[PDB]
Amino acid sequence: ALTNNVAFQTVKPGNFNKDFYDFAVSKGFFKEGSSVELKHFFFAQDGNAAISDYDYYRYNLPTMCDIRQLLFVVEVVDKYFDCYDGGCINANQVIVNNLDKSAGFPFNKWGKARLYYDSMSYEDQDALFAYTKRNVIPTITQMNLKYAISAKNRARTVAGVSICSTMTNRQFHQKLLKSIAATRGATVVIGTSKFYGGWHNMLKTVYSDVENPHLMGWDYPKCDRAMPNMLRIMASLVLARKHTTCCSLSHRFYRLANECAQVLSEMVMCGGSLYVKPGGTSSGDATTAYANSVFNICQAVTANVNALLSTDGNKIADKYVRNLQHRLYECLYRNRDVDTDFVNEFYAYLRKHFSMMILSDDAVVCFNSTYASQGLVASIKNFKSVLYYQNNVFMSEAKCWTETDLTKGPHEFCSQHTMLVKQGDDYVYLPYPDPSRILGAGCFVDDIVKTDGTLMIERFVSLAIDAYPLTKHPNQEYADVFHLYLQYIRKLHDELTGHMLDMYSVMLTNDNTSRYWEPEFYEAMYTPHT
């Protein structure tokens, strides 16, 4: 413990935004039986919120994951990452955004990262870095309660990490992390806008000629508590693989050690006291969304490997594929060392019959249908089996959609539905969002961030630019929600200049704005060009 009395947390309600809502009903909304109706809200949480949540790590077990097939699908996954580059850098090359966030504990008794990124030379930071390549630095961590709109009354936590970790893991990974972030047209798609028809391009990629195509997604039940450790180490290793020159050996090994002490299983200053974090990842360090994606690919592959071998032997028709499977087993158990010929062969086989697009822990796979029925590509039931025997949770089948027509696109990826509609002359995919989200984000806020939009507006802009695609929808009330947001923004602005002309007659001398309360400024958005 530390204090002499524990601290209790609470999460206030959200606050209302009456007017906009009064507007909304005045336009004939929420008239009963509507197909749009509030559904996201600011849920409130009582006293013992944190620890009554951090308890969930008891969902995390030890595990032994089979060693041979792991020592192989790490190689295939590796092959998925041969188009980037990274290595150690130097102080004057890291790049921080919003260098003003928290700084974990106890450094948060003294100010944000302005100080520590400021009160240190570059040589300071380089001593630090090229120090931890030979030592260990156990750290702490804080747990924070998020306060933002939702749809399920549970808690939320985010692990604010202490500065001496990020301040190195950056230096050690930045080159790669960029190289991934800024490449167009591949598997991992972290960082590719959905504006200006980049979304449509994402799809017309992840199609790419697989013969009999069906679409399937899935989702991971409690993704970041239950991930066993072995897979976390596997992620960190596949990332460090490209460090073959900057580093050495013992440099790496201590660097891995410093990471596994700083994010995997170190103490957790939850509340006013210290615990231990037995395992599982931690959604706040320097290398998440990437590591989550990698792990995810590891699951998808392992599922396919099982789906292959599990199949009988003497019903496979394509003598080529039978000789594949056979060769596969041989390389997997009998052999000892890699068959680069075979590995390249496999990777190609997958790209041909099981293409996949990945965001950090959020997938879509387009796959060769009749194969599935023949079991040479991991249809869902294999996902049940893997999540079981090596994530030891149970992925219900009420969450993994599946799609046979490919026109009207997938079902939901990164929480947008995908309509296919006619732009100009041709046909493109616009992603549009669950309307209730847009509304129930209009009416509930923190305080001044709304309570009174007349100061703000800029929000209402961004919201409308985000709920434009709903103008194309064949349902009705949907398209309305756009025309609402419009006539709103307009009237709002009108009263603003009214006041600045009324109290203080200082009439504002020109317009320009009128592009806002007219749709053309938006739709230009979803259209390829600049």
Binding site: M503, Y504, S505, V506
Partner: protein
């Protein structure tokens, strides 16, 4: 925040920080101020200063709009732009604010310091908004004045109740009563925590100071206190409300056919419901508080409050209520820390009375029915605003006679105040008269009203009593040791001590004389009932041993003598001071 131009009414967004009140000024009026007097500091949603790191400027003249901040001359980036501009100052309401031309008295109050009878008469004859403003900057001057003083530390603690103290190097030691309260610290370099409230009084002999402490901290030799103080707050209520008619008295039910000791009153009483508020001019103790009693009961059951300026005044008034009004519907309220112990015969401090009684010093801000104020001619316009705010009702009775002394105004030192200029309703009565009248007493002798009739009042004041010849003088002098702002007599009061054997009816007088510590030592003298001249007033008791000690103006004022003599039911002792005045009152001496 925002508001209106405290003078030009214009809604604005400035505060002349150079002021001590920092009020809301229109752009134009602010311009005129910052051009006129010395006040050169302007605040809005930030201050207007030389936001250069090193540069510091008071006025906003050489202040230039730089980028988005401000600068003096020396940092004016060439995208500059002066703030002070062509007879306006940039702020808000750029084009709305309408200036006003009482720049005159605006400067006159913003610059002065109540040194002047002129400063007062303007302050009590300026505009209403400026009237309250003058009022609060008056209290502000008062508070700064009180702040200017010094500190008291200990030489040694003689007793747990008796202490031996001193002050710092020279800093002025105030007078002595209970109106001087302190709070100390046992500072072990640190450990400087409040050690509680302590008031201080004269020891019984020599260098001694009797301290009453609220805490139980045993004081030692390395100990000290600070004279503790409040902080006055702004107000907003007008000093006066609109007087209007009705058709009659509607919505209430009076006392049909009341009585005879209240007979000469019901006409007046009904006049209550005709004028929106009412008042009474009358001679000192003239059925006056009696009249108020008969009126408040003239409506038998109502949310009534009896209240006045001082302690003993409202005390005797509420004993008067008691004496007439049924005590069962009566509650006398007193203050909290309440180091004063008073007539407390009802349910004390019991808030929800129907006939509530409390002094202004913390009149609980409530609504009521016809409330009366008593001794209007005492307090300041500030107070009248304060009570107007705290209170809500139907009819507001303000009784007084500015021939009765008013506030101490211990800042008012040179160039006294003149009658109506005491406060607003003083202007009312001195001009528009009272709202009712009755003009004779039941309460004081005839020779004594002959005394008071050639001095303060006119001979036109004629009471209803007789000469009982229980009024005698003297002119003898001797010791005047004096202490701090309250000088005493020893041989005059000792001749009084042997004189306590002279005439029987004088073993229950009241020791009165124009000094505080004088009457305080008077308890050490013979254990004689006493009263400082102010602690009397309006009342009427039988005998008063007046020992006019010193011969300063505060000691020989005609009005302080008059309020000493307007309270004698039966007679006066007064061993006089000014042979001119000593013969102005007409008795035998010895």
């Amino acid at each position: 925040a925002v508001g209106a131009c405290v003078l030009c009414n214009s809604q604005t967004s400035l505060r002349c920080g150079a002021c001590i009140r920092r009020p809301f000024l229109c752009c134009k009026c602010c311009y005129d101020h910052v051009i006129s007097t010395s006040h050169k500091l302007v605040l809005s949603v930030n201050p207007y200063v030389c936001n250069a790191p090193g540069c510091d400027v008071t006025d906003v003249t050489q202040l230039y709009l730089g980028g988005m901040s401000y600068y003096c001359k020396s940092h004016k980036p060439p995208i500059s732009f002066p703030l002070c501009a062509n007879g306006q100052v940039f702020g808000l309401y750029k084009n709305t604010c309408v200036g006003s031309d009482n720049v005159t008295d605006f400067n006159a109050i913003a610059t002065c310091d109540w040194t002047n009878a002129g400063d007062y008469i303007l302050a009590n004859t300026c505009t209403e908004r400026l009237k309250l403003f003058a009022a609060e900057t008056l209290k502000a001057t008062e508070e700064t004045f009180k702040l200017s003083y010094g500190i008291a530390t200990v030489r040694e603690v003689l007793s747990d109740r008796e202490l031996h103290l001193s002050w710092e190097v020279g800093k002025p030691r105030p007078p002595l009563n209970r109106n001087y309260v302190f709070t100390g610290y046992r500072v072990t370099k640190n450990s400087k925590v409040q050690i509680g409230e302590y008031t201080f009084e004269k020891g019984d002999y020599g260098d001694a100071v009797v301290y009453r402490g609220t805490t139980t901290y045993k004081l030692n030799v390395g100990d000290y206190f600070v004279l503790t103080s409040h902080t006055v707050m702004p107000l907003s209520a007008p000093t006066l409300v609109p007087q209007e008619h009705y058709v009659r008295i509607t919505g209430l039910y009076p006392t049909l056919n009341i009585s005879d000791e209240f007979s000469s009153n019901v006409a007046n009483y009904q006049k209550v419901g005709m004028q929106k508020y009412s008042t009474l001019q009358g001679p000192p103790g003239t059925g006056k508080s009696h009249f108020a009693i008969g009126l408040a009961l003239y409506y038998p059951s109502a949310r009534i409050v009896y209240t006045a300026c001082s302690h003993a005044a409202v005390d005797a008034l509420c004993e008067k209520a008691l004496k007439y009004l049924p005590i069962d519907k009566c509650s006398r309220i007193i203050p909290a820390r309440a180091r004063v112990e008073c007539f407390d015969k009802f349910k004390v401090n019991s808030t929800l009375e129907q006939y509530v009684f409390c002094t202004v010093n913390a009149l609980p801000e409530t609504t009521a029915d016809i409330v009366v104020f008593d001794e209007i001619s005492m307090a300041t316009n500030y107070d009248l605003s304060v009570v107007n705010a705290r209170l809500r009702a139907k009819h507001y009775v303000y009784i007084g006679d500015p021939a009765q002394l008013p506030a101490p105004r211990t800042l008012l030192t040179k160039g006294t105040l003149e009658p109506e200029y005491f406060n607003s309703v003083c202007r009312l009565m001195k001009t528009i008269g009272p709202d009712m009248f009755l003009g004779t007493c039941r309460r004081c002798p005839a020779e004594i009203v002959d005394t008071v009739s050639a001095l303060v009042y006119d001979n036109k004041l004629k009471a209803h009593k007789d000469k009982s010849a229980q009024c005698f003088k003297m002119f003898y002098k001797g010791v005047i040791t004096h202490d701090v702002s309250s000088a005493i007599n020893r041989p005059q009061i000792g001749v009084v001590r042997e004189f306590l054997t002279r005439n029987p009816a004088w073993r229950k007088a009241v020791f009165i004389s124009p000094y505080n510590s004088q009457n305080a030592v008077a308890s050490k003298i013979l254990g004689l009932p006493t009263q400082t001249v102010d602690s009397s007033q309006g009342s009427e008791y039988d005998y008063v041993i007046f020992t006019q000690t010193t011969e300063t103006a505060h000691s020989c004022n005609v009005n302080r003598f008059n309020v000493a003599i307007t309270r004698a039911k039966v007679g006066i002792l007064c061993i006089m001071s000014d042979r001119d005045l000593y013969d102005k009152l007409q008795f035998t001496s010895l």
